């Protein structure tokens, strides 16, 4: 999990300008806010 | 651990120049029927392995295909807890004045015993039964 920076989320909400109401979710949301989603993938665990 | 990346987690063991975060998460969950808000009490008690230490020699054999190397921990089983209603299990100072090297020296046996299957038995720089059964203590609050 990575806690955005200033720079994240500048990325973030840039990404997302264009529509006001998504750019205004990220840039509301104070930085070091918006954490990063980095869920593993990878199996191992057989199922059962 | 999924293949490729146990094989990294190897890799790491044996070359791979990493610090594996040895997270020792000693979560003391009580009830809320006597009180205890949060509580569970956690604290990982973290241990960045150092790049192929003899610790993580051990760890390279270990999980190259042998099951017979005791994986030296730095003294860390947290023998005396401060634990209180809140979330964390922060051991007493002074009871182990170092505690991180202070707590008690544990020790770690993969077995893989193929027939890899593959155990994992936690054991005690000192294990008398205490790789079956840790004694510790938990000073509750």
């Given at each position: 999990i990575i806690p955005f920076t200033a720079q994240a989320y500048e990325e973030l909400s840039r990404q997302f300008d264009p529509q006001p109401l998504a750019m205004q979710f990220i840039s509301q949301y104070s930085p070091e806010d918006i954490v990063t989603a980095q869920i593993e993938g990878s199996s191992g665990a057989l199922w059962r | 651990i999924s293949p490729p990346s146990r094989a990294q987690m190897k890799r790491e063991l044996y070359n791979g120049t990493a610090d594996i975060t040895l997270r020792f998460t000693w979560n003391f969950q009580r009830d809320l029927?006597?009180?205890?808000?949060?509580?569970?009490?956690?604290?990982?008690?973290?241990?960045?392995?150092?790049?192929?230490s003899t610790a993580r020699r051990q760890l390279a054999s270990l999980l190259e295909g042998t099951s017979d190397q005791s994986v030296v921990?730095?003294?860390?089983?947290?023998?005396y807890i401060r634990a209180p209603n809140g979330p964390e299990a922060n051991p007493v100072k002074q009871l182990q004045?170092?505690?991180?090297?202070?707590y008690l020296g544990v020790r770690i046996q993969l077995?893989?015993?193929?027939?890899?299957?593959?155990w994992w038995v936690i054991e005690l720089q000192e294990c008398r039964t205490d790789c079956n059964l840790l004694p510790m203590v938990i000073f509750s609050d």
């Open positions: - | 029927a006597k009180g205890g808000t949060v509580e569970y009490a956690n604290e990982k008690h973290m241990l960045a392995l150092a790049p192929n921990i730095p003294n860390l089983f947290p023998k004045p170092n505690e991180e090297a202070d077995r893989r015993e193929q027939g890899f299957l593959e």
